Structure 1
Amino acid sequence: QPVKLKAVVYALSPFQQKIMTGLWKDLPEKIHHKVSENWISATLLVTPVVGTYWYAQYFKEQEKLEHRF
């Protein structure tokens, strides 16, 4: 079903704008935003993997040492 909208949109032609410089514009703010918003998500992804890997290597090392005469 079509939606009934009321809006005014103004647009500039693609050939009247700079195309690429906006990628490296306010880069530190972009990094700020990605880190600040995503640090819990990143912790929940990485910590179980690294913790489990480290514990497995620790277990393997101690087990190898225990069987050594």
Structure 2
Amino acid sequence: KQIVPVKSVIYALSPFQQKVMTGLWKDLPTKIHHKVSENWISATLLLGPLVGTYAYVQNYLEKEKLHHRY
């Protein structure tokens, strides 16, 4: 567990010489663009099986209910 020095040169600024909470909502539309563009595959994979299974279950339940309802 050692440190590996890199030979950099780092300029830093005081936390009291720069605004804090503006960067949250700065450049918001591009942030939302990224969040949606680079992740729609993941959301599709997470939710698609769930909604598909729910639709299948409801279809089966209703069809059995009608068939057995005399």
Q: Distance in 1 between matches of 2:26 and 2:5?
A: 37
Q: Aligned pair count?
A: 69
Aligned pairs (5 A) from 1:38-57? 38-57=39-58
Q: TM-score, normalised by structure 2?
A: 0.94
**Post-superposition shift, 1:20?**
0.3
Corresponding position of 2:27: 26
Q: In 2, distance between residues paired with 1:47 and 1:33?
A: 21
User: Which structure 1 segments of 5+ residues have no match?
Assistant: none
Matches of 1:19 and 1:53, distance apart in 2: 44
SS of alignment partner, residue 3 of structure 2: coil
Instruction: Please list every run of at least 4 consecutive aligned residues from structure 1 whose deviation after the TM superposition is greater than 2 angstroms.
Output: none
CA distance in 2, matches of 1:20, 1:37: 25
Tell me how large the CA RMSD over aligned residues is: 0.7
Per-residue Cα deviation, 1:24-49 (whole angstroms, up to 9, x for no partner): 01100000000010000000000000
The answer to which structure has the higher helix fraction is 1
State the alpha-carbon separation in 2 of the partners of residues 2 and 53 from structure 1: 52
Which residues of structure 2 form unaligned runs of 5+?
none
Residue identity (%): 74
SS, match of residue 66 in structure 1:
helix
Give me the whole-angstrom Cα distance separating, in 2, the residues matched to 1:49 and 1:2. 46
